Design a protein around this ligand. Structure first.
Ligand SMILES: O=C(O)c1cccnc1
Lengths: 337, 216, 289, 56
């Protein structure tokens, strides 16, 4: 009935009023005196070849040497970045894969896609081959992202506007997160592994509680679908990339938006977003085959990563912050430095 | 300068590369078809003569086809339609016995307009299948072809009924210099639709080969 | 010895130099531009691109070897260089001629297997296999053309080192046989392949498209060029064959005017070396016009 | 029906009592973190080509 409607409206107005009241000075005014970072120039140091189709996802290992990539040709390759060797090549049952992950311990990898199933692979067996350890079912839409919490827990987000926390031991949904009104496109895990954020297609992002509960923040501000999300290394902020050619940095404690990283020569959407080890550089991947580096504290561009002949679809930074790897639709990975 | 355990790793990587190349060469000799429709439009019978994605393999004249039926994907089509950018052709199923009901022909026209003029499928040929001919006979004999298409200037026989439904669908194509629409008036039992698909795919493959030459 | 009778009769030296210069400038421009596009300018690299690049390489060698051509022509004919340079120039000419012809035939055969048999496995071969075939054909043509290197081709009538590999003799040696074969056999293969490609496309109702018409025209023009270029030379060669066989070796007057005629038509074999780049690389929707 | 609206408005109250600090403090903390770990980031302060593992 109506009373719910104007109660919701009044609550929204109260939230907006509190957010406005908490705003006294922008980040630009605070960081005006900080000297510029200068031009940042990186050169391609390695190129990984062997995929025969568009590359849709990638993930680094916690040792900052091994990485896994997924492509539409039905293969899941594990690389040795230092020597560009191939360690494993896992053939998938379904060729429509759009995500992958690498376990913190290094014993498992995951993948999923249009088949609505997350598959877990075991890399350290006594038979010398990689075998499927479990297939997780229950989502009614394509899987868009998955991240490992432990060797026995994984968080997945699918196109049925839901996120779920699984139990790899039994293959059951321990917890289900609801509240979005559009396809959930990406998620990121907090450094302490207690909270995580998701970016849906309703132009909003929410902050969940893994231990128990549901969303508590519901950040807004974008004008189109959010395609990527990433936590700040401090764990008190995150960045979102959307289809309106704009990246934005949100903060949790003040519950607002700090900056917007836009331009006038950029009209294409963002496919991936990542930070650096210090948190000063913000690397984003665009559809115009480029990858821009943004000074996070001044919202000023400070470099370009050109060299890809098609759309950049994935991006990652090592744990020690010594390299940046970008995958694209021309079936090549390049490690910059 | 490589040590004893590095040369063996290089050899293993070389073997992996050889296997990957062989698999790619084997998988580059197959025809991929994307099957679309408005639901309950004869997709079942079309599959008969030949969760998420439902693949289907069949062979004809020493040629291996693969048909992907998206089907039950109820999410936003915009976010995954680019996965099928490299399909050889698109099969579209329309029922001719849906004009006097609710309107569904307008929905099929809307879907065809959305798919045909997509930015990803700017050069993908479309094979149009028009089903339910047998029921369509009595349906046009009884119900006139004006409830769905107003301002119709024609008789009520099959001679004009077959047309003015193919013309409208073929008129929704706007880039008539890169892709072509193939139309077939299939029925419940014909046992010759596979030949039509084979002819369309042969034309598409000839065009792709000519493009590869640089001739185009 | 004393079985051949050659001359050099001014008129050739008068006519040729402007013609060689005009062909040389255009050929260098076109093939250098083509190679420049081929390397670090063209991303995609398929088998047909490899074959066309090899054709470009052979054509390029011939164009860089044209300058000297104005030598047994300028100063009438003296060839101030030595034995080896003469052998090297003649060997390179022959090699480049037969390589370009072989790669034209390979291109025609490759296009035949893509319209008549679209599903044949030959249409998808690895670039490495293309390189292997390229090296094998290069080896074949060099092997056919090595016999020039051993022999001495610097016969000098006095104050004039006449560097020629085409002399009026009656032996039916290597050179004449290859000169006739490199025209007749590739002509047969090209005419056969181009006929089926046009006729299949015509019968399977593919002419209604717009790009198909240009492809048909550009397939016909290739045969037209190949026939207008290499044909007059072999015609004159067979003509002088008939006179030489009917006559003997002396009475050189009958063999006098045939020299300048032969070399006049031989200039067309390089004229092809400049007409080739536009027709094959430039005249194609592949790269924007 | 009304259950969905009730759930939405309940979520709105739940998000309406969150404690919020000023933007200036968050900005200062962001600056402090970005300044403290400035020498440990090999991307904006390039390392010499002897400890770089990707050299090359
Ligand atoms: O083969 C040639 O092209 C040639 C041979 C001799 C003299 N000039 C050209």
């Amino acid at each position: 009935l109506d009373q719910l409607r104007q109660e919701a409206e009044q609550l929204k107005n109260q939230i907006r009023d509190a957010r406005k009241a908490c705003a006294d000075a922008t980040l630009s005014q605070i960081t005006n005196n900080i000297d510029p970072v200068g031009r940042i120039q990186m050169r391609t140091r390695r190129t990984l070849r062997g995929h025969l189709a568009k590359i849709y996802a990638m993930h680094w290992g916690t040792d900052s040497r091994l990485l896994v990539s997924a492509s539409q040709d039905g293969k899941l390759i594990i690389w040795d970045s230092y020597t560009t060797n191939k360690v494993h090549a896992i053939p998938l049952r379904s060729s429509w894969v759009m995500t992958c992950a690498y376990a913190p311990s290094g014993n498992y990898v995951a993948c999923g896609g249009l088949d609505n199933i997350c598959s877990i692979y075991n890399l350290k067996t006594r038979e010398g081959n990689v075998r499927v350890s479990r297939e997780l079912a229950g989502h009614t839409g394509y899987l868009s992202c998955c991240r490992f919490l432990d060797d026995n827990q994984i968080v997945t987000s699918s196109g049925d506007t839901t996120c779920a926390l699984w139990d790899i031991e039994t293959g059951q949904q321990t917890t289900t997160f609801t509240g979005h009104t559009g396809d959930v496109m990406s998620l990121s895990l907090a450094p302490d592994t207690r909270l995580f954020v998701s970016g849906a297609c309703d132009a909003s992002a929410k902050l969940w509680d893994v231990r128990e509960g549901m969303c508590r923040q519901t950040f807004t501000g974008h004008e189109s679908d959010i395609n990527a999300i990433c936590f700040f290394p401090n764990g008190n902020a995150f960045a979102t990339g959307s289809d309106d050619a704009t990246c934005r940095l949100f903060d949790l404690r003040a519950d607002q938006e700090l900056m917007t990283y836009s331009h006038d020569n950029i009209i294409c959407g963002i496919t991936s977003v990542s930070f650096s080890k210090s948190g000063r550089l913000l690397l984003a991947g665009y559809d115009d085959f480029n990858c821009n580096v943004w000074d996070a504290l001044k919202a000023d561009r400070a470099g370009v990563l050109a060299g890809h002949d098609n759309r950049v679809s994935c991006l990652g930074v090592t744990d020690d912050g010594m390299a940046v790897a970008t995958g694209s639709w021309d079936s090549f990975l390049k490690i910059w430095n | 300068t490589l040590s004893a355990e590095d040369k063996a790793a290089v050899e293993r990587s070389k073997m992996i590369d050889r296997n990957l190349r062989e698999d790619g060469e084997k998988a580059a000799r197959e025809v991929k078809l994307l099957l679309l429709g408005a639901g309950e439009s004869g997709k079942s019978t079309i599959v008969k003569q030949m969760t998420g994605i439902v693949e289907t393999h069949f062979t004809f004249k020493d040629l291996h086809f693969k048909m992907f039926d998206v089907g039950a994907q109820r999410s936003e089509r915009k976010k995954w339609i680019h996965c099928f950018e490299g399909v050889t052709a698109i099969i579209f199923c329309v029922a001719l016995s849906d004009y006097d009901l609710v309107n569904r022909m307008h929905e099929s026209m809307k879907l065809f307009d959305s798919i045909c003029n997509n930015k990803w499928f700017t050069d993908t040929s479309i094979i149009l299948f028009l089903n339910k001919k047998d029921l369509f006979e009595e349906k046009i004999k009884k119900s006139p072809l004006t409830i769905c298409y107003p301002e119709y200037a024609g008789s009520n026989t099959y001679e004009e009924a077959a047309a003015y439904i193919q013309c409208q669908f073929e008129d929704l194509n706007k880039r008539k210099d890169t892709k072509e629409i193939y139309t077939h008036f299939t029925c419940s039992t014909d046992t010759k639709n596979v030949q039509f698909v084979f002819d369309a795919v042969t034309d598409v493959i000839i065009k792709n080969n000519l493009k590869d030459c640089g001739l185009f | 010895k004393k079985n051949c009778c050659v001359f050099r009769d001014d008129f050739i030296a008068k006519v040729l130099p402007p013609v060689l210069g005009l062909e040389f400038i255009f050929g260098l421009l076109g093939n250098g531009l083509a190679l420049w596009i081929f390397c670090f300018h063209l991303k995609s690299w398929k088998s047909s691109r490899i074959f066309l690049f090899n054709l470009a390489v052979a054509d390029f060698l011939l164009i860089i070897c044209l300058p000297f051509v104005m030598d047994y022509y300028v100063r009438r004919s003296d060839w101030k260089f030595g034995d080896i340079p003469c052998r090297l120039v003649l060997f390179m000419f022959a090699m480049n001629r037969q390589g370009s012809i072989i790669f034209l035939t390979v291109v025609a055969v490759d296009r035949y297997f893509r319209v008549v048999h679209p599903h044949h496995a030959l249409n998808k071969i690895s670039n490495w296999t293309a390189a292997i075939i390229s090296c094998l054909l290069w080896g074949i043509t060099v092997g056919l053309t090595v016999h020039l290197l051993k022999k001495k081709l610097l016969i000098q009538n006095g104050t004039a080192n006449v560097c020629i590999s085409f002399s009026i003799c009656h032996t039916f040696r290597w050179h004449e046989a290859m000169f006739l074969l490199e025209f007749f056999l590739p002509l047969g293969i090209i005419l056969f392949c181009s006929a089926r490609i046009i006729w299949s496309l015509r019968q399977r109702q593919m002419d209604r498209h717009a790009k198909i018409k240009r492809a048909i025209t550009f397939i016909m023009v290739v045969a037209i060029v190949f026939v207008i270029c290499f044909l007059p030379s072999v015609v004159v060669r067979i003509h002088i064959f008939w006179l030489l066989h009917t006559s003997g070796t002396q009475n050189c007057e009958v063999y006098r005017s045939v020299d300048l005629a032969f070399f006049i038509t031989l200039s067309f074999t390089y004229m092809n070396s400049m007409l080739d780049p536009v027709v094959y690389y430039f005249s194609s929707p592949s790269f924007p016009n | 029906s009304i259950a969905q609206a009730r759930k939405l408005v309940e979520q709105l109250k739940m998000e309406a009592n969150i404690d919020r600090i000023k933007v200036s403090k968050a900005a200062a903390d962001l600056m402090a973190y970005c300044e403290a770990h400035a020498k440990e980031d090999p991307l904006l302060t390039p390392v010499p080509a002897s400890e770089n593992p990707f050299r090359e």
